[PDB]
Design a protein around this nucleic acid. Sequence first.
RNA 1: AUUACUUUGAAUAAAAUAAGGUGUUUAAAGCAAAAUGAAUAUUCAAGCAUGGGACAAUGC
RNA 2: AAACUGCGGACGGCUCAUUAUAACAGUAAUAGUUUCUUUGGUUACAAGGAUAGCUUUGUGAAUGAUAAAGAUAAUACUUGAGCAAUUCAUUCAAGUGAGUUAGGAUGCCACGACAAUUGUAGAGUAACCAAUGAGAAUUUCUGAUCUAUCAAUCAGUUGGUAGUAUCGAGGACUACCAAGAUUAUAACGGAUAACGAGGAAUUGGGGUUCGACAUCGGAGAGGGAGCUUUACAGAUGGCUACCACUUCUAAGGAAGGCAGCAGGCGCGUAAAUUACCCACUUUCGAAUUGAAGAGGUAGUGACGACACAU
Lengths: 141, 106, 119, 127, 56, 256
Amino acid sequence: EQTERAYQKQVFHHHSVKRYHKQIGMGFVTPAEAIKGTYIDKKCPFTSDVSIRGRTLSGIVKSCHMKRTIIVRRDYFHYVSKYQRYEKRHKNIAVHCSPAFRQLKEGDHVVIGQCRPLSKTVRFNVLKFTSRGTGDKKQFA
Amino acid sequence: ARGLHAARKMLAQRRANKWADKEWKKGKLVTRYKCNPLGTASHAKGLVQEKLGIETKQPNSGIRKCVRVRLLKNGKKITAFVPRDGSLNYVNENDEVLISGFGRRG
Amino acid sequence: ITGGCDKDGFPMMTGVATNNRVRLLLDGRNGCYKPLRNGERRRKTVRGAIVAGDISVLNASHIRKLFNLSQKDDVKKFVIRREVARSKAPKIQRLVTPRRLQHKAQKLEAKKLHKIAML
Amino acid sequence: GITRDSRHKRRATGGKKNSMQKKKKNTMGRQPANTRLGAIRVHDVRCRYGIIKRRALRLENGNFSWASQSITKGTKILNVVYNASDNDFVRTNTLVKGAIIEIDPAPFLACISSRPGQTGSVEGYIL
Amino acid sequence: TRNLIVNPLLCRKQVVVDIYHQTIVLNGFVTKYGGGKTSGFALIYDTLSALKKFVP
Amino acid sequence: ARGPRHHLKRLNAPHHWMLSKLGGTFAPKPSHGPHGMKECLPLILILRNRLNYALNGREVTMIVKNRTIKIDGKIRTDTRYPVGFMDVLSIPRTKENFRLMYNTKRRFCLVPLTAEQAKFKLCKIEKRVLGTGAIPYIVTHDGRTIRYPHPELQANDTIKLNLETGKIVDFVKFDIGNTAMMIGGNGMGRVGVIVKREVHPGSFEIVHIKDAKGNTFTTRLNNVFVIGKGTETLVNLPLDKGIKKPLLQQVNETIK
RNA sequence: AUUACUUUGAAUAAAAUAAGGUGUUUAAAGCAAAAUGAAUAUUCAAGCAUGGGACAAUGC
RNA sequence: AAACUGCGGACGGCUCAUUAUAACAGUAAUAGUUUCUUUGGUUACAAGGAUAGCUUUGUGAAUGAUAAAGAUAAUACUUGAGCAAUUCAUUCAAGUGAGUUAGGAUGCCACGACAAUUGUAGAGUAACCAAUGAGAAUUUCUGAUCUAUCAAUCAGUUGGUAGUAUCGAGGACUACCAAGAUUAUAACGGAUAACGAGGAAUUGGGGUUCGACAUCGGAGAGGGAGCUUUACAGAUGGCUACCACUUCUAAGGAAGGCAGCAGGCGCGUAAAUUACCCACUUUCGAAUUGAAGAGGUAGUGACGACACAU
């Protein structure tokens, strides 16, 4: 929590300090680990000053090797008019992951939400996740 | 490959198989502006240097009057026919001559 | 002395100091150039402060001050009246000059009347 | 001039971009003014849309604050001690936000909490 | 003949003339195919006060 | 495009401006004001096409600058003033007054306003915000900012505005029992009674409107301009009474 | 439990395509005239909402 | 008339060289930024110098060339008298799906006004809140021609922290830490006789080819680069330096950029008058009036389309 050069503090800090947390919008519960946890993240959708605007997508987590940021693979089908047939496609999206989702791992379906640009590529935030199977490689966030 | 989701191969197969088209490939390779003396140009302007008589092919028997022309753009040497009878007298050297193909396309 | 142009009518700059007219980005800031555009800095070959051979040619509010012209006298006779064959006093600019019942009627002393700040 | 566009960067795949247009004024950039310790000297910059930015070059006095006592009085800056970004900023005594500096509490360790290159003044609190 | 309307603000009347063969300004004088019948658009400004100022 | 544009092309203008395709190269771009680019009709169009007073734009300047036309309570002298919704028009010189209301045929219509009834103009509130110093206020559909309104007045209501006094008279809430004139897309120009509203938190709120004869259509919430309460209309509706004819008696009648 | 599919809508620049009307004398044209502006039909591929779950994919 | 001052030439017109997820089309966001103009609302009986236009002396062949002196005004530049918004630290807390949010309060810090304003007869100014404006700009999702005689590509590169700069998020930039990012669903690279779209030619259906060019969006003004003015320009019918050209010449020197409108050379199979007018449409301006090679008219014109002679 406090191991870097600068003093890491919440964006909205107020003396009781209290664990700041705001309520996200259209029917997303606040994670339990975002309340009792001692972590500090400046880009979390709940305990920080980043909102969730219009677009909202979902995908499968494939990479869990970057700090507080994961890559979600979304697979769809593209329709070709001439041949009246579809074709498999995919796109990789870099999504910021808050430290609240402690059990998040590669290969788990994840719902992501848009926000203001957080990095050069990361502009989506993880909202909720669902557990799935195992493949002997328990790579977490 | 007939499947509903199998559109990747059918587009790949059609792309590869289109290159065997002798005429479609000709109009897409970079040789019209390189190997064809006319190129996309309808006609060509040049100068007359040498006059030829090309003997007709085996079924026929005669001498076809012809000229050798060097263009003003590429500078290559090409052979041109005389469209009418006795027109070799009218033709001269170092004069503007227009060359535009024949009945068959190039 | 004073300023002056060059043999080719190129002003000598009191700022720079050269013996042959040099070119620098110029405007009306030092008078040597008249900006055509807005902020037209032109590199014009103007002379320097040196007076060497190339230089060759070396060369009522405020009307309330023409001579102590105060205001309260309402003097339209103190103001110059050169005559032409008309008696022509130029004007009397912003002051308390005689009429002054357009100024302070509503344009300066309505003012809480033509400036009302109310509830 | 300095620019802040991504047209000169590389894609996530390592593919170098190709230039379609020259530099534009909408993505301007200006050199930093490392606010050092010296006589008060602030230059006002003419930003876009006509707004004015106060660029501080050298300051000595900051309006520090105390949160446990609710008092905000100015105090003279002594020297830059700790910076969270570059230790080389300490030697130059550059005044930037988050720079731990020491002061003598004559009217009362301080951390600068403003942008002297933008606001034009130094303010902080008590650690 | 035809249509007669009076402008209440420009002090003029708009009329449509039809030929069957200083205060009046005649424009649009064209005939049919082959000649003969001719038409136009006569404008009358009555008083000279409005005419001298409502004119290009 | 180094900055804001000053010319509007003839073919880029909104289609409901009745402008021809061979009339000219450019169209009169409305100046900035209370109404939007595609939500307003320029004053030049009204006095050249809808009223036919001026043959061309040469005589349009010799009318508006003569302080002859009053927009709402005040008077405007701009040749391209943005004249949008039903804000009143007054020309005392010709003893005729109009109103810029919509119609079912996707246009702007000029209903006749009598002298007595031109003194008021209903305005739809766009937002309610509380400024600094605890001074709340509202902004209406023409951008008009007024002082302290009723504390019950919400963001999406309608108010009865006065011209000479510039005061509030009556306000109608947005409910399930009101009548509205549509100002949007497919339904714009229609009059009906709000019967149901469905709210989707993510994107939009959608309402259901049923006509007087029983026709039902659907539109977005931004397009709901309340015109009255309890099947009552506070303004004079256009010639076709704002009802939608389903093309059944459009081609047939126009033959005869 | 999503997705796909399927049905309805919302909103969506004009011009252009098909055109609704209109004797530029016909026609190309024009939206004009003797109040009308077509509801004008869209818009491939995506995005939002909704009725249905047969055929389909995702692990319990 | 002038000239000072204000506004405008960042609109408009032209061309398609660059450009291969770049731009562009639909779509969602700006609770991540935002002006100019316009609209609604709010917050001493009058100080001071100098400056053009004005008068007088010149230079050189001169450019929209040029200096000194004597004067002369402001709604040009400042002084001066009757809260609004900005930064920081603390706190109280109601619309919205969504906010320590609009908003209020506490304490210093900074700017701090409503022209020291104007016609005898027909308004203006200074900041601020909000519309403008679906506007401009950044950004989300999907979608693009051929090529494997292109299979591996990237090191500011991928992520994090702190600062810096910007109008603003952001490796946009700097410092420290980790090794990460993409790829057979074609990454990386190469080609174009590649500006993209609405659309055009032709089709029973399916499709193939074209789209520089009416309109919208992008870029540029011979080639890059750097800046000034201001609300918007990295402006080029603005400037500065170099590269390549071109002009007058008193031989000392000066500026110029027709991918604007006519016209010329060259290139070619290939394409028109060195005309008139702001009267139609519209823009700019101190504003009914001035200007507009935009726009309209006039001339050539067998690119084409319609009717019709012998």
